[PDB]
Design an enzyme around this catalytic site. Structure first.
Site, PDB file in Angstrom:
ATOM      1  N   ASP A   1       0.833  -1.193   0.000  1.00  0.00           N
ATOM      2  CA  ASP A   1       0.000   0.000   0.000  1.00  0.00           C
ATOM      3  C   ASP A   1       0.872   1.249   0.000  1.00  0.00           C
ATOM      4  OD1 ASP A   1       0.139   1.109   3.034  1.00  0.00           O
ATOM      5  OD2 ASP A   1       0.116  -1.087   3.054  1.00  0.00           O
TER       6      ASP A   1
ATOM      7  N   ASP B   1     -10.818   0.527   0.289  1.00  0.00           N
ATOM      8  CA  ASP B   1     -10.720   1.933   0.648  1.00  0.00           C
ATOM      9  C   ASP B   1     -11.725   2.828  -0.059  1.00  0.00           C
ATOM     10  OD1 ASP B   1      -7.535   1.004   0.945  1.00  0.00           O
ATOM     11  OD2 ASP B   1      -8.195   2.448   2.461  1.00  0.00           O
TER      12      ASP B   1
ATOM     13  N   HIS C   1       4.306   4.136  -3.855  1.00  0.00           N
ATOM     14  CA  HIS C   1       4.929   5.351  -4.362  1.00  0.00           C
ATOM     15  C   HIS C   1       5.514   6.209  -3.246  1.00  0.00           C
ATOM     16  CE1 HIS C   1       0.496   5.547  -4.109  1.00  0.00           C
ATOM     17  NE2 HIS C   1       0.711   6.668  -3.446  1.00  0.00           N
TER      18      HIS C   1
END
Ligand SMILES: OC[C@H]1O[C@H](O[C@H]2[C@H](O)[C@@H](O)[C@@H](O[C@H]3[C@H](O)[C@@H](O)[C@@H](O[C@H]4[C@H](O)[C@@H](O)[C@@H](O[C@H]5[C@H](O)[C@@H](O)[C@@H](O)O[C@@H]5CO)O[C@@H]4CO)O[C@@H]3CO)O[C@@H]2CO)[C@H](O)[C@@H](O)[C@@H]1O
Ligand SMILES: OC[C@H]1O[C@H](O[C@H]2[C@H](O)[C@@H](O)[C@@H](O[C@H]3[C@H](O)[C@@H](O)[C@@H](O)O[C@@H]3CO)O[C@@H]2CO)[C@H](O)[C@@H](O)[C@@H]1O
Ligand SMILES: OC[C@H]1O[C@H](O[C@H]2[C@H](O)[C@@H](O)[C@@H](O)O[C@@H]2CO)[C@H](O)[C@@H](O)[C@@H]1O
Length: 1526
Positions: A533, A668, A536
């Protein structure tokens, strides 16, 4: 068996993209291991790198790679291994990189720079995907179904979880993703892990307990498992965070955040006493915020000392100034500006009198001034006395230093409080979300930016929690010193987490790296993959090391990533280095129906009828290559990657977009119920499942749960309500994909079409190999938007079959159980009424929807394209080699080339080239004319090109390819080549029209490669084993050598004949010029192995000898033209080139040749029996030239008048030749005859240039006598060996000069008469008139010509003599002269025919110009500036010889000290053929041009492919091969 991929590399070591699939990653196909083989028993893949021959990376080149040499060796990121590049100037080098285990592998190159230094290329990464199998069945990466489940909502017992397991097992999911099953922190959120090395004690206890459960899922329901791995943070209450507080960013490890700590604890100290003296706790008023911010602009911002964190302490610098008044005084320089320039003065004190870290934020007063160096400037600028205005001056300087800091402060403060009253609104005052809870021990006015505790070391700490930004670049670590996030309050903090501080390596945080490793390799022992998760936000080097540690434990680790980088390239770079195997895509992110169509199109596949790749004319075809005779070397169980055709050119490895894991809804994003409706759950998951990738869903999406479950607070358990919602449909969708996964492999094997008409979305999925496919019609329920009718769905050449149809309907609201999360009651209603019509004539299928097809409904059809069976790929990729078996080097000309005018010669003017509408005609009627256009189309997959349009608009071009060969059916092997094309083009027409273009190029390309391979097989070894650039020039022989009907080389038989160039010099009499033929005879025929064809050309011109000369314009022997003082010496030079190269070449001399002419130069007794009377051997023919040349020749142009030349006057008709035996050279010619290679005849009536020769070369041309010396040198050694019976030439009067004496006369006088000395001192020996001169160090162009200034002209003609007769040149004189031609006369591809300094330099040829400029009008400038490619050949031919003898850096020798060149010389040769390589590479006509205007500008008139332009470049490659490559 054969799992080898070809990875072609560029001249700079970069990988070559074979197709334009977009910004991608070099990924290797996910395939199972061979039958009964495990990891280690054989290589998984073999990457075969291809390095060009003569590239700058060949020079001392090495191949570095971190690929372990064997399976016993483990993997290390920086443990590279050396591989030697085998240098060659002809043969490219292949190097294998055997891969034994999946992972991430990179390679770079080390070579010797042109500066003789070391240089390195980029690191180029490629990934090998893991091999996923559950029980024993391989799970293709794009047939994965992932069901994400949250641990704390599945019941408190292991069997309570195995109840949820059996529910998703019925829905036929094959993979389960877990939120991390570790002991959770204070907030109990699944992502704030209390202890990473301890699993949740509520359920499991030991590590075998969880391992036995995951293996149970594998053996019970055939389900692989994977977990989330949390790198960026940990729980805010870990008992190891007290022992090791340095694992996070604190005031010691990251001192820049100290300014943010004193501000955060200025609010936890404020939000518990705010209302006590303030006013509004929790009000919903704009005025309440203003007075709260007024309490902020008076008790926190203004109560932190105006922030000395930026500003230099003004009065505490003056105090510390005078305190010592700089006892250490030390300035006598004048680097200080004047006091007037207060700007640079402030920067000056800032650049010299500052402690380290000025501007850098740290402690309270961490930006201070070096006093001893500041007071030193103050004593220099003003005075050595302090009371002399220093308190005013020093303060004046520092106030101006802090002006950019005072304004940097106002820009920071304005962002701190603007971000505050914007979030505290949304946090409390319902803008679009409420919950207005007042001051609390958990909910103050500001969220905790730092977690406070008292560590076991005794001291207090303040570790920060991580979060996110708005549009801020995620790659920038907000917790690092480069960002000002925690100060300007731009952090959406997650209080349960604590931002973990990784450094440049394990050296900065030892315990954190050690603990995370043992936490990663613990899950790697159990699960099959990871989910990362916010990848980046995880730095690369952090994830690179930890993912490698996991892959060393689990070699088949399957990585999924939530990757959001600004560019696709950075996303690709992250996937390249980290080894990511899947990138999460969310379907709920589409705001409208059009956005979901575009998201579906991205991950759906390639278009229907998409082009397939084939090795065309951009590949080297080694004659010694393996082949599958009938596409039969591929057994299925071997799981071998297939080559493109019968030629075993392996499957190219090209960057493809990273694989995607499409999630209809994650854990999410909000529920379909929230964003859209509950009905859209069916069409949304139907469009997602139809994509050509992996799919996934969260638990509750199929069960139609009410709203997005908060992962932090909620404690309710999943409902055991079975078969609710879409569970019945996902069982059909997932099982359907299981059938497809058996044969869908590569990116060219899954095609797709998507349409969007309102609330409907169409998905046509198609397997390109068999024709099978599915049609999906999904009505989307984003909003209830009324009744909408979709038009008639019409399929072409297809049949449809109803599979299933459903509709999801809402039966009220969901229960409000406060113990179990129950879903919305939904009805799954099966629909009918879909009318499937099928026209049995057009083979068209019509599908009509029933009026009862509400929003939130789908219908699935099973389609099958007509014509395509499974045995279609086998039929097209076979038989082409056997068809080309009987081809000859002459017959391949009709299959591939033939210009339109050449085709008109055989069709009497009825055929030609297939005019492609809205484009034009292919350059050649053969396959090459298609391939030059098709290659850039296949590369870009351009289905909109007019060729692709015409191919699906009809079958005209399909039959044109086969019907051409009726003209050449009777030739060697064409009948069996046409028959293969006929049977394949017939099978192609029975296909859907939109599929003809992709299959048309494939059939043409495969037959092209087998024809080009057949050419390398018939030719010699130096050609067939070389680079593409060498083989490309070799095919020019097949281009030029072609049998015609209107002309030939023999008058009695129409046999093969070499053309001077296409397309102008190819038909009728203007085809074979003796000059152009024999200059190319060594390059086009001898270098390639066309000995018999080269002998026929030599014997053909031997019958046409007359006036002791070889005719230029050969009229096949039927009355030619003899205005050629150049032809006879290029002809006799080819005789020497034949005997020297051809084994047993001395036989040519004793080959009788029917002399079709009275030797006494008569008229044209054509059919008179004197033609078929006597003959003369080549031996006699050779000596006939020499003796008659100097001895006796005296002729006017036989049978003249306008019938011969219309413009050339009578003064040019009477022309002659004589040898001045006091020099030995061949003089001759007039100023009215252009009997040399620069044969230009004026024709401008508007400039009175009619008949005026453009470049008359009377006298002694450098080429003529240079070839004469080579002839004399040859005929001497001939008699010494025992053949040539002649030794004395008859003098004109009656004397007899000897041959060796004539050979010595040239050797003693040639360079004396031609060379122009660089020194004016030696002008008395080389016969020079210094008044008419241009450049010194120059070899002459003519000796005693008509105009004496044409003698001293820099022209590329001398280099012919430098190659054929090097004995006439002293080394230092020739090398110094050929360097001038390289600096002046050498264009990029063509050789300048005249010195640009000379006044007659007209380098723009235009034969349409009919003006008054003498040269430009009617093309008189032909040889007065324009750049010719053939002279470049002879230039670089001698550039190799003389720079080998002269300069010593070009020498290194080697074995037996045999003189071999150095890398520096090969580098000087390679760099002068890349402009040539470009030309033929990117030219429609496969070849180099006749002409070229100034600096490579395409001369519109120039013939694009010329014979002696290419053969002269093939001559060079034979020299470097026949003299060193032994
Ligand atoms: O077949 C029998 C024939 O009998 C007579 O032939 C003679 C011609 O009349 C005579 O002029 C000469 O041919 C010349 C030519 O005229 C002359 O210009 C020169 O050739 C050059 C061109 O000058 C030059 O511009 C260029 O032309 C190319 C062009 O670059 C290219 O882009 C493309 O357009 O093709 C053009 C040629 O078609 O290059 C050529 C290279 O030769 O020299 C020629 C002699 O070498 O001699 C002929 C001898 O038979 C009749 O007059 C003729 O009509 C009959 O066809
Ligand atoms: O049918 C052939 C040819 O005949 C004519 O050409 C001739 C001329 O008419 C004739 O005067 C003569 O011209 C040449 C001179 O005799 C010669 O001394 C020198 O001056 O060159 C002149 C041009 O060649 O001979 C020619 C022979 O062809 C007619 O004009 C042509 O159109 C016709 O093709
Ligand atoms: O015109 C003088 C100019 O050009 C020269 O080249 C030629 C010239 O074109 C002829 O007319 C004659 O003068 O002979 C010259 C040398 O061959 C030179 O290139 C140049 O330096 C000179 O000034």
């Amino acid at each position: 068996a054969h799992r080898t991929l070809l990875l072609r590399l560029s001249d700079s070591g970069e990988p070559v993209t074979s197709c334009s699939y977009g910004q991608g990653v070099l990924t290797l196909p996910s395939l199972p291991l061979p039958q009964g083989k495990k990891l280690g028993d054989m290589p998984v893949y073999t990457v075969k790198l291809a390095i060009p021959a003569g590239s700058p990376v060949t020079r001392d080149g090495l191949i570095w790679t971190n690929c372990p040499p064997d399976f016993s060796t483990q993997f290390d990121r920086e443990k590279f291994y050396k591989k030697i590049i085998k240098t060659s100037f002809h043969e490219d080098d292949h190097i294998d990189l055997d891969i034994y285990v999946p992972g991430t592998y990179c390679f770079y190159l080390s070579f010797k720079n042109d500066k003789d230094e070391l240089e390195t290329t980029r690191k180029f990464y490629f990934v090998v995907l893991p091999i996923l199998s559950v029980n024993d069945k391989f799970i293709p990466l794009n047939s994965i179904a992932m069901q994400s489940v949250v641990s704390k909502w599945m019941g408190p017992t292991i069997k309570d979880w195995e109840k949820v397991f059996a529910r998703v097992a019925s829905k036929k999911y094959n993979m389960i993703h877990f939120t991390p099953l570790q002991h959770r922190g204070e907030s109990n959120s699944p992502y704030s892990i209390y202890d990473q090395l301890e699993f949740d004690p509520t359920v499991f206890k030991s590590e075998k307990e969880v391992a036995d459960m995951v293996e149970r899922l594998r053996t019970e329901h055939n389900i692989l498992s994977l977990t989330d791995i949390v790198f960026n943070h940990t729980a805010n209450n870990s008992q190891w965070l007290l022992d090791h507080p340095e694992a996070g960013y604190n005031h010691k490890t990251s001192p820049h955040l100290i300014s943010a700590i004193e501000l955060d604890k200025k609010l936890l100290d404020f939000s518990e006493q705010m209302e006590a003296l303030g006013y509004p706790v929790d009000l919903k008023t704009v005025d309440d915020l203003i007075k709260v911010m007024d309490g902020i602009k008076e008790h926190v911002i203004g109560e932190l000392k105006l922030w000395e964190f930026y500003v230099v302490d003004v009065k505490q610098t003056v105090s510390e100034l005078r305190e010592k008044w700089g006892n250490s005084k030390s300035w006598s320089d004048d680097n200080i500006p004047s006091k007037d320039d207060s700007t640079n003065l402030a920067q000056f004190v800032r650049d010299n009198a500052t402690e380290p870290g000025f501007g850098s934020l740290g402690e309270r007063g961490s930006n201070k001034i070096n006093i001893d160096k500041f007071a030193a400037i103050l004593k220099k600028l003003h005075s050595e006395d302090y009371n002399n205005g220093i308190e005013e001056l020093a303060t004046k300087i520092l106030n101006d230093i802090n002006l950019p800091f005072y304004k940097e402060y106002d820009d920071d403060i304005n962002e701190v409080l603007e971000q505050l009253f914007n979030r505290i609104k949304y946090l409390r005052i319902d803008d679009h979300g409420p919950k207005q809870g007042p001051i609390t021990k958990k909910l103050p006015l500001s969220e905790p930016y730092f977690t406070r505790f008292k560590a076991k070391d005794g001291e207090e700490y303040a570790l920060a929690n991580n979060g996110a930004i708005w549009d801020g670049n995620p790659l920038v670590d907000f917790a690092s010193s480069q960002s000002k996030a925690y100060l300007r309050r731009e952090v959406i903090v997650w209080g349960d987490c604590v931002k973990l501080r990784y450094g440049k390596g394990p050296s900065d945080s030892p315990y954190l790296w050690e603990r995370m490793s043992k936490y990663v390799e613990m899950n790697a022992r159990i699960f099959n993959g990871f989910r990362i998760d916010n990848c980046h936000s995880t730095p690369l080097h952090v994830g690179q090391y930890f993912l490698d540690v996991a892959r060393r434990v689990n070699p088949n680790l399957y990585v999924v990533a939530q990757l959001f980088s600004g560019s696709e390239a950075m996303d690709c770079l992250f996937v390249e280095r980290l080894g990511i195997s899947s990138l999460i895509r969310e379907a709920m992110q589409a705001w409208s129906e059009e956005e979901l169509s575009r998201l579906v199109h991205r991950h759906g596949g390639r278009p229907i009828g998409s082009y397939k790749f084939v090795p065309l004319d951009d590949f080297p075809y080694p004659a010694d290559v393996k082949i599958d005779e009938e596409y039969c070397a591929y057994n299925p169980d071997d799981h071998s990657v297939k080559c493109v055709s019968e030629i075993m050119i392996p499957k190219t490895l090209t960057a493809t977009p990273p694989h995607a894991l499409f999630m209809d809804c994650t854990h999410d994003n909000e529920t379909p119920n929230q964003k859209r409706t509950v009905e859209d759950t069916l069409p949304n998951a139907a469009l997602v499942a139809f994509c050509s990738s992996a799919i996934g869903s969260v638990y509750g999406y199929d069960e139609v749960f009410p709203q997005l479950l908060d992962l932090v607070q909620e404690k309710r358990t999943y409902s055991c309500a079975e078969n609710t919602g879409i569970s019945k449909v996902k069982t059909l969708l997932n099982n359907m994909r299981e059938e497809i996964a058996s044969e869908a492999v590569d990116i060219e094997d899954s095609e797709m079409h998507v349409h969007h008409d309102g609330q409907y979305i169409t998905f046509h999925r198609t397997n390109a190999k068999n024709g099978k496919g599915w049609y999906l019609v999904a009505r989307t329920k984003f909003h209830s938007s009324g009744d909408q009718m979709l038009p008639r769905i019409k399929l072409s050449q297809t049949k449809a079959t109803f599979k299933a149809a459903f509709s999801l309907e809402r039966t009220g609201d969901a229960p409000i159980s406060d113990e179990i999360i129950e879903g919305i009651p939904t009805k799954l209603r099966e629909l009918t009424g879909f009318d499937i019509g099928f026209d049995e004539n057009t083979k068209e299928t019509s599908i009509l929807l029933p009026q009862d097809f509400p929003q939130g409904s789908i219908v699935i059809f099973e389609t099958q394209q007509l014509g395509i069976d499974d045995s279609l790929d086998h039929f097209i990729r076979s038989g082409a080699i056997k068809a080309t078996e009987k081809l000859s080097l002459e017959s391949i000309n009709y299959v591939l080339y033939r210009a339109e005018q050449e085709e008109y010669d055989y069709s009497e003017g009825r055929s030609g080239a297939y005019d492609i509408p809205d484009y034009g005609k292919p350059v050649y009627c053969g396959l090459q004319g298609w391939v030059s256009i098709l290659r850039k189309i296949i590369f870009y997959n351009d289905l909109a090109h007019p060729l692709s349009n015409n191919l699906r608009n009809g079958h005209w071009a399909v039959d044109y390819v086969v019907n051409r060969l009726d003209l050449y059916k009777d030739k060697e092997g064409v009948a069996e080549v046409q028959e293969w094309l006929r049977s394949r083009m017939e099978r192609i027409k029975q296909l859907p029209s939109y599929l003809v273009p992709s299959f048309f190029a494939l059939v043409v390309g495969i037959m092209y490669g087998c024809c080009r391979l057949r050419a390398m097989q018939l030719m010699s070894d130096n050609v067939g084993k070389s680079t593409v650039f060498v083989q490309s020039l070799a095919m020019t022989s097949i281009q030029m050598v072609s049998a015609m009907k209107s002309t030939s080389i023999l008058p009695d038989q129409n046999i093969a004949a070499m053309a001077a160039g296409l397309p102008h010099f190819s038909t009728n009499y203007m085809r074979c010029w003796g000059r152009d033929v024999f200059i190319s005879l060594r390059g086009l025929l001898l270098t390639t192995g066309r000995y018999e064809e080269a002998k026929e050309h030599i014997l053909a011109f031997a019958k046409t000898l007359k006036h002791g000369l070889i005719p230029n314009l050969l009229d096949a022997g039927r009355n030619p033209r003899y205005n050629a003082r150049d032809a006879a010496w290029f002809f006799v030079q080819a005789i020497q080139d034949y005997v020297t190269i051809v084994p047993g070449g001395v036989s040519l001399l004793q080959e009788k040749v029917t002399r079709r002419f009275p030797l006494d130069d008569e008229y044209i007794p054509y059919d008179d029996p004197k033609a078929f009377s006597y003959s003369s051997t080549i031996e006699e023919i050779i000596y006939e030239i020499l003796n008659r040349h100097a001895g006796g020749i005296k002729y006017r142009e036989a049978n003249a008048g306008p019938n011969l030349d219309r413009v050339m006057k009578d003064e040019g008709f009477n022309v002659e030749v004589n040898v001045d035996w006091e020099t030995g050279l061949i003089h001759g010619g007039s100023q009215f005859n252009c009997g040399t290679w620069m044969d230009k005849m004026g024709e401008s009536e508007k400039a009175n240039s009619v008949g005026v020769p453009g470049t008359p070369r009377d006298g002694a041309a450098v080429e003529i006598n240079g070839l004469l010396k080579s002839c004399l040198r040859f005929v001497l050694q001939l008699s010494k060996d025992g053949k040539f019976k002649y030794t004395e030439v008859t003098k004109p009067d009656g004397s007899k000069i000897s041959l060796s004496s004539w050979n010595d006369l040239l050797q003693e006088n040639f360079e004396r008469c031609f060379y122009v000395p660089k020194n004016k001192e030696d002008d008395n020996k080389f016969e020079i008139d210094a008044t008419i001169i241009n450049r010194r160090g120059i070899y002459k162009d003519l000796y005693r010509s008509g105009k004496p200034y044409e003698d001293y002209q820099f022209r590329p003609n001398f280099t012919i003599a430098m190659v054929v007769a090097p004995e006439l040149f002293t080394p230092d004189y020739a090398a110094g002269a050929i360097e001038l031609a390289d600096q002046v006369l050498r264009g990029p591809v063509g050789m300048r025919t005249l010195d640009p300094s000379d006044y007659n330099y007209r380098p723009y040829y235009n034969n349409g110009e009919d003006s008054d400029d003498f040269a430009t009008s009617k093309g008189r400038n032909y040889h007065q500036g324009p750049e010719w490619v053939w002279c470049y050949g002879y230039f670089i031919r001698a550039y190799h010889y003389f720079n080998f003898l002269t300069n010593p850096k070009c020498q290194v020798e080697g074995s037996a000290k045999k003189l071999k060149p150095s890398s520096y010389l090969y580098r000087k040769l390679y760099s002068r053929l890349l402009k040539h390589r470009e030309w033929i590479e990117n030219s429609p006509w496969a070849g180099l041009a006749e002409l070229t205007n100034k600096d490579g500008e395409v001369c519109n008139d120039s013939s694009p492919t010329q014979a002696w332009s290419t053969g002269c470049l093939l001559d060079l490659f034979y020299d470097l091969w026949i003299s060193y490559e032994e």
